[PDB]
Amino acid sequence: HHEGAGTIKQRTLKNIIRATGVGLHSGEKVYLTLKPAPVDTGIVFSRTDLDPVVEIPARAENVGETTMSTTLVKGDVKVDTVEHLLSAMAGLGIDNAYVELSASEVPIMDGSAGPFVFLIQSAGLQEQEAAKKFIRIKREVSVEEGDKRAVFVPFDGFKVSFEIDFDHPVFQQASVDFSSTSFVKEVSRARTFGFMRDIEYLRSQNLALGGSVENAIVVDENRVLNEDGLRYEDEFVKHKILDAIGDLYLLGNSLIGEFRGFKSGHALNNQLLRTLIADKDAWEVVTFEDARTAPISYMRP
Ligand SMILES: CC(C)(N)[C@H](NC(=O)c1ccc(C#CC#C[C@@H]2C[C@H]2CO)cc1)C(=O)NO
Ligand SMILES: [Zn+2]
Numbered sequence: 001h002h003e004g005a006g007t008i009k010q011r012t013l014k015n016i017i018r019a020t021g022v023g024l025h026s027g028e029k030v031y032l033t034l035k036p037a038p039v040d041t042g043i044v045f046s047r048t049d050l051d052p053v054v055e056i057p058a059r060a061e062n063v064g065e066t067t068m069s070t071t072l073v074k075g076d077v078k079v080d081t082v083e084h085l086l087s088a089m090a091g092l093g094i095d096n097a098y099v100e101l102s103a104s105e106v107p108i109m110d111g112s113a114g115p116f117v118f119l120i121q122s123a124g125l126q127e128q129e130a131a132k133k134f135i136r137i138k139r140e141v142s143v144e145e146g147d148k149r150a151v152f153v154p155f156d157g158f159k160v161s162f163e164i165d166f167d168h169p170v171f172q173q174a175s176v177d178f179s180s181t182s183f184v185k186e187v188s189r190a191r192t193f194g195f196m197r198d199i200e201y202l203r204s205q206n207l208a209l210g211g212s213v214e215n216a217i218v219v220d221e222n223r224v225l226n227e228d229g230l231r232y233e234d235e236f237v238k239h240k241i242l243d244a245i246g247d248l249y250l251l252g253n254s255l256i257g258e259f260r261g262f263k264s265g266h267a268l269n270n271q272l273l274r275t276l277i278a279d280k281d282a283w284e285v286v287t288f289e290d291a292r293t294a295p296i297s298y299m300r301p
Contacts, residue, residue, distance in 0.1 A: 005290035007131045010095040011301060012036045014124030021107025024081055024192070024216070025068060027209030030103040034120070037096035039130040042252050043089060045072060045079040046100040058086060060250045060273045066266040068207055070247055080105040083266065084192070087246030088116035090254060091183035092125065093298045095132060111191035111215040113242055117184055125301035131287040134296070137257030139282035143271045148263045150272040152282070155258035156295040162240045162261040169222050174237045178296065187245070189231050190238035193217040244269055251277075253285065256295060
């Protein structure tokens with residue numbers, strides 16, 4: 001036993017994770033396997049139902065549609081609704097992993113990232129022999145469209161603010177800083193949500209076909225319909241934060257910076273990432289030779 005500086009290191013899974021579920025939008029039954037991956041692989045989604053297998057790295061450049069969920073595309077092959085799983089992975093510091101899926105949509109589980117964090121954390125994480133690379137924000141980068149707004153600001157840590165503006169009796173602002181807030185405890189359990197009003201339209205378009213009170217906060221004209229209510233008083237805005245954490249992980253590396261979202265969503269989050277990547281003065285890749293002086297820290301593996 002000796003004392004010295006240690007690099008903050010890349011992580012993969014210690015064991016394989018298998019789950020079965022349903023696609024929120026497609027309603028399809030889907031089998032999910034997460035597997036360990038070598039250093040610098042990133043998170044790569046593998047459609048194992050196809051022959052040959054089609055692999056899509058979870059990066060901003062592969063993002064197709066972003067109307068309802070965050071979708072990845074390569075050719076005519078898609079992987080839908082990647083944000084909640086990706087959010088779980090970013091939240092626990094996973095750099096490298098294969099996500100195999102038997103169908104085009106990640107399973108929705110209970111509508112949050114909780115079950116994923118739980119499955120992953122039961123399997124365990126494996127630190128690997130390479131420095132973890134971070135993306136540090138060095139300038140303000142903002143995108144807007146109409147009243148929607150998404151911003152990166154320099155910040156020595158990682159924090160996220162979000163504000164939504166729904167006119168609905170059921171109601172809007174939250175900030176979370178990973179120096180104090182636990183991702184796992186205060187964010188990961190926040191479920192997706194939908195309004196009864198949109199549901200038939202959505203289904204009329206073959207969207208929300210797997211959605212139910214079992215996997216979503218469902219809201220009618222006046223109230224939450226789920227018999228047992230909300231897991232957090234501000235669950236709705238907490239889920240928007242959960243979504244943003246997963247959409248930001250399409251950078252392919254954790255962030256050192258601050259994100260602020262104002263009625264933001266998947267499209268604008270993706271626009272923001274693209275604008276950031278284009279503006280190489282506004283960011284740089286960094287490592288930390290000494291975890292003790294880093295501005296971020298992680299749970300034991
Ligand atoms: C919140 C956000 C960002 N808009 C998005 N979620 C969705 O779009 C979405 C979520 C739930 C439903 C439903 C249902 C249902 C249902 C069945 C009718 C009730 C009966 O049992 C529909 C759409 C998201 O969290 N994306 O990541
Ligand atoms: Zn979501």
